[PDB]
Structure formats: C-alpha cells, structure tokens
C-alpha cells in the first residue's frame, strides 16, 4: 500500500506477485484503488488454475 501510494505520487513501475493469494486485500483495497502520474504502470501476475479473481478488476485492466 505504501509503495503504491508513493509510486502514484512520484511515478515508477510496480509489480505484484501472486495476487490470488491475498483475495480479501485484492477484493477490498485494490478494487477501491482501481475503481476510483503519467509514467506509472502496475503489473499483476496470477495463476490461471487458481482462485477466481473478481470480475470488475479484470474488466478494469
């Protein structure tokens, strides 16, 4: 959360690893963050055979 806020304020790429493993966090905080700099790109990697990620996050990426 701190790094996402800082990289939104002052730029810089960020990457998240195995986001299916923090389902409550990705259902609340990341959903709120994407629901609401110019060289800021955030990457998420996930497993196809894992748990079902929320639909609105995937349709907003």
């Amino acid at each position: 959360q701190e790094e996402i806020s800082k990289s939104k304020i002052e730029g810089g790429w960020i990457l998240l690893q195995n986001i299916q493993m923090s389902l409550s966090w990705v259902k609340t905080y990341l959903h709120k963050h994407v629901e609401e700099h110019e060289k800021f790109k955030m990457f998420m990697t996930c497993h196809l055979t894992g748990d079902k990620l929320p639909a609105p996050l995937l349709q907003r990426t």
């Binding site: 609340t28 959903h31 709120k32 629901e35 929320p54 639909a55 609105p56 349709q59």
Partner: protein
C-alpha cells in the same frame, strides 16, 4: 379484460420531459436503458438496486441531482457516520458495492419509519435520527452475478444493466461518424436535439 393493442412502456410511463432530462444527463439511446431508468425513477417507496458493471449509472444519477448527491461505499471506514450526517442533511445517497450489504441500514431498506407527529424518524445503528423527506437512497453494485442477501434481494428492486445488439450498433456507428465526418455527426446530433426540443415546445 381489455388492454392497449400497441402498448409501449416508454410511451406510457416515461414522459417526454423526463426523457429529455435523462438524455441530457448522459443516458444511452437504448430502449432497454430508458425502460430501466424509468423503472428506477418510478419507485418512490422501495429503494432501487443498480447493477451497472460499467459504472455509468453512478455518473448518470450524479448528474441528475447535480452537486447535492453524495457517493458512499460499504468498504469505507466511517460509512455509518457519513450516512447519518447525510440523512440529517437530506441529500440523495448512492451506496457503492451493494453486494457487500451492511445490515445496519435494514431499517432504511424496509422503510420501517416511526412517525413522530410531523417529524419522521428512523432507528439506525443504536440511535434514532430525523428524516428530512428529501432523502433518496440508491444502491449500486458493479459486480454482475454476485451474491446478494435474501433480505436485501427480496426488499429492493433489482435492475440489471447489460449491453444488447442495438447498443453495439449505435456505439459503432457513432464512433465511425466521429472518426469519419465530425461535422456531419455534429449537425446530426444538433438537428436531433433541436427536433426533440421543438416537439417538446
């Protein structure tokens, strides 16, 4: 029992002035969207449930009521206090993420108001609060085919928002007009607005 042979819901409930207001707000040109919007606006007793995966109705009803509307959510801290202050003030409230329903507002959903003379109060949380009478509650949920409590599902008016063939055709044709001949599309939309305003006049 007799009924109108060529009856249409839009031609009966959705009046021309409200249709103009909706199309000015940003509502799509679809018959389905107009029917759903008129269904939502005609429920003054039970609160309506909005399921819009594109988050379009949030800004549509935001533009309908101007700047007095307030956006709340079930996932933010202090949501109870925000709704308490909003119902004290008397502003239209749209709650986001409706599939994460909070059972505190079950008295507001069921409309089990306790009338106290000329003042109407509701018991929410652990204390009563006055209802201004201008309060209008909307519940929005951008997640389709999710889980909803049976209490809320029974006591609200579920309104879906899905994209049909006519929406795709209209959007594609508008995009190709804008990218091909901007002046022609501008003249077309200006003539459409002028014709509708002339018919209303």
């Amino acid at each position: 029992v007799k009924y109108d042979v060529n009856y249409r819901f839009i031609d009966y409930l959705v009046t021309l002035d409200e249709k103009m207001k909706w199309l000015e707000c940003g509502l799509d040109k679809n018959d389905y969207f107009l029917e759903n919007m008129s269904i939502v606006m005609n429920s003054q007793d039970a609160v309506p449930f909005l399921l819009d995966p594109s988050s379009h109705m949030i800004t549509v009803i935001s533009n309908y009521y101007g700047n007095k509307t307030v956006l709340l959510s079930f996932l933010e801290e202090g949501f109870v206090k925000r709704l308490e202050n909003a119902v004290r003030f008397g502003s239209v409230v749209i709650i986001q993420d409706g599939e994460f329903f909070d059972p505190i507002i079950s008295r507001l959903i069921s409309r089990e108001f306790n009338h106290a003379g000329n003042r109407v109060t509701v018991e929410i949380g652990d204390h009563e609060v006055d209802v201004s009478g201008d309060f209008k509650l909307f519940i929005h949920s951008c997640d389709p085919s999710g889980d909803i409590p049976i209490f809320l599902r029974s006591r609200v008016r579920l309104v879906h928002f899905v994209t049909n063939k006519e929406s795709i055709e209209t959007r594609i044709f508008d995009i190709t007009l804008t990218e091909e001949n901007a002046e022609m599309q501008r003249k077309r939309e200006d003539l459409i607005k002028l014709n509708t305003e002339y018919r209303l006049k």
